[PDB]
Amino acid sequence: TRKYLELYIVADHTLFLTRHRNLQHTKQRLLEVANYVDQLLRTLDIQVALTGLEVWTERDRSRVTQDANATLWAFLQWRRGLWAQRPHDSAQLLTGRAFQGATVGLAPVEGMCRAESSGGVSTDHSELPIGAAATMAHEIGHSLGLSHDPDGCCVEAAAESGGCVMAAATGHPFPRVFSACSRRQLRAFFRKGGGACLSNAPS
């Protein structure tokens, strides 16, 4: 019984523009962010399989604004049509837009595999790909029913180590591991029936 996450990642038009309208380099950024997401999720014993990749080179397919929540749900609605053509477990939007309130990412809680909510949004806020990846892994965490780490969690992964992924705030150094509290919450989530779509090994 092994767990696999079929991930579909999207780069919005703004990100494309910040990447000098360079398709190849925008795709490379997505690939490197996806690689770090895989590294982080593997500390939960979940392997990531990059199912698909998309760059909105001419226009955003869903409305992206300063409102993180509005952006998240507009993306999720668009994701429904995407899913019908390109099946995946979770779709993640990586945006070059900055959200109001210093928010860098959002995702519906316990929505993994749900038709209306299996996705998330993250701003590419750091020069380092691991920044966006830690945010994306955090949103995927919420999708898997993980809550923010209580202060008595993340016994170790010291300050200089970046801490743990489910921390409520982010910043360099970025987290590379999920806390033991997160591990326990994930196992309970799976036992209770959540994330049923993570059971298949990608073809």
Ligand X SMILES: CNC(=O)[C@@H](NC(=O)[C@H](CC(C)C)[C@H](O)C(=O)NO)C(C)(C)C
Ligand Y SMILES: *[C@@H]1O[C@H](CO)[C@@H](O[C@@H]2O[C@H](CO)[C@@H](O[C@@H]3O[C@H](CO[C@H]4O[C@H](CO)[C@@H](O)[C@H](O)[C@@H]4O)[C@@H](O)[C@H](O[C@H]4O[C@H](CO)[C@@H](O)[C@H](O)[C@@H]4O)[C@@H]3O)[C@H](O)[C@H]2NC(C)=O)[C@H](O)[C@H]1NC(C)=O
**Catalytic residue ranges:** 139
Single residue of 169, 191, 193, 203 touching ligand X by CB under 6 A = 169
Is 138 annotated to bind ligand?
yes
Rounded least distance, CB 92 to Ca ion, Å = 15
DSSP states of 123-167: E--SSSHHHHHHHHHHHHHHHTTPPPPPTT---SS-GGGT-BTT-
Measure CA of the first residue to CA of the last residue in the chain; give whole Å.
Answer: 16
Backbone angles phi, psi at 102, to 5 degrees: 65, 10
List b or e across 86-96, with b for residues whose CB sees 16 or more CB atoms inside 10 angstroms: eebbbbbbbbb
For residues 104 and 92, the answer to whether their CB atoms sit within 8 Å is no
Q: How far apart are CA 130 and CA 26, in angstroms?
A: 15
Query: Under a CB-based contact definition with an 8 Å cutoff, are residues 151 and 167 in contact?
Result: no
In the window 153-192, what residues touch Cl ion (CB under 5 A)?
187, 191
In the block, tokens 């038709």 appear at 115
Tell me the per-residue interface mask from 46 to 85 with ligand X, x by CB under 6 A, - otherwise: ----------------------------------------
**How many residues touch ligand X (CB under 6 A)?**
14
Q: Is 148 annotated as a binding residue?
A: yes
What's the one-letter identity of residue 64? V
Cis peptide, bond prior to residue 175, ω within 30 of zero: no
Residue 173 contact partner, candidates Ca ion, ligand X, Cl ion, none, CB within 5 to 8 A by sort of partner: none
Q: Binding partner of residue 105 among ligand Y, Ca ion, ligand X, none, CB under 5 to 8 Å per kind? A: ligand X
113's contact among ligand X, Ca ion, Cl ion, none, with CB below 5 to 8 A by partner kind, is none
Contact between 89 and Ca ion per CB under 5 A: yes
- Shorter beta-carbon distance to ligand X: residue 171 or 202: 171
Give the CA distances from residue 75 to residues 18, 83, 119, 132, 153, in Å, rounded to whole numbers and listed in that order. 20, 12, 8, 17, 32
State the binding partner of 14 from ligand Y, ligand X, Cl ion, none, CB within 5 to 8 A by kind.
none
31 is a site residue for ligand X (CB under 6 A): no
- What is the number of the residue whose Cβ is closest to Cl ion? 191
Q: Binding to ligand Y (CB under 6 A): which residues in 19-78?
A: 69-70, 73
Residues making up the binding site:
138, 142, 148
Give contact residues for Ca ion (rule: CB under 5 A). Answer: 6, 89, 197, 200
Give contact residues for ligand Y (rule: CB under 6 A). Answer: 69-70, 73
